[PDB]
Design a protein around this ligand. Structure first.
Ligand code: NI
Ligand code: NI
Lengths: 100, 101
């Protein structure tokens, strides 16, 4: 039972400009969008386009042991996750599968 | 109608050996490939690549029925094919020919 990626947040310089580009190149759906970040649903996961000042980039995994690495925070959408960094300084989020 | 997939992500790390240890410790994932310049970790729904940026550039790869419409496809040693374009912010984007997978 391999852990899954849940979503990847990459830095962009202009959210509307990015959403225009990704949706014209890729078969995807705009799940959420304002002026500081956007979320694009793909078939196997979702891609957040983020202004790093407003929403830092990161990669999120599901983990049965997310709690063992940090205290789970509850988000407005009802899911639970915590953040850590890998040895390089990359932001890694561990989603609580039970909160999905 | 049918959504495209993210096929893999390659993120920059400072040290491939240590990064492999960390990810394989924190997550249920399989090492699929590894050298001193990069590694490929198999998760459930895609693969994660850990690259030294100066050897293998970080990028996100998507499967696309129209990959060849955006750039000339390149058959890689492993048989698969893909082009590389750039998003407005300069993020490297690889498009995979689904028939080559
Ligand atoms: Ni997140
Ligand atoms: Ni690639």
């Amino acid at each position: 039972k391999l852990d899954d990626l849940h979503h990847i947040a990459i830095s962009v310089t202009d959210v509307a400009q990015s959403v225009e580009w990704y949706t014209s190149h890729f078969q995807c759906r705009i799940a959420y969008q304002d002026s500081t970040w956007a979320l694009l649903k793909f078939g196997n996961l979702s891609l957040a386009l983020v202004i790093p000042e407003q929403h830092p980039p990161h990669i999120a995994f599901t983990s049965d042991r997310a709690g063992e690495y940090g205290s789970l925070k509850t988000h407005r959408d009802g899911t639970r996750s915590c953040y850590i960094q890998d040895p390089s300084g990359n932001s890694v989020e561990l989603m609580d599968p039970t909160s999905l």
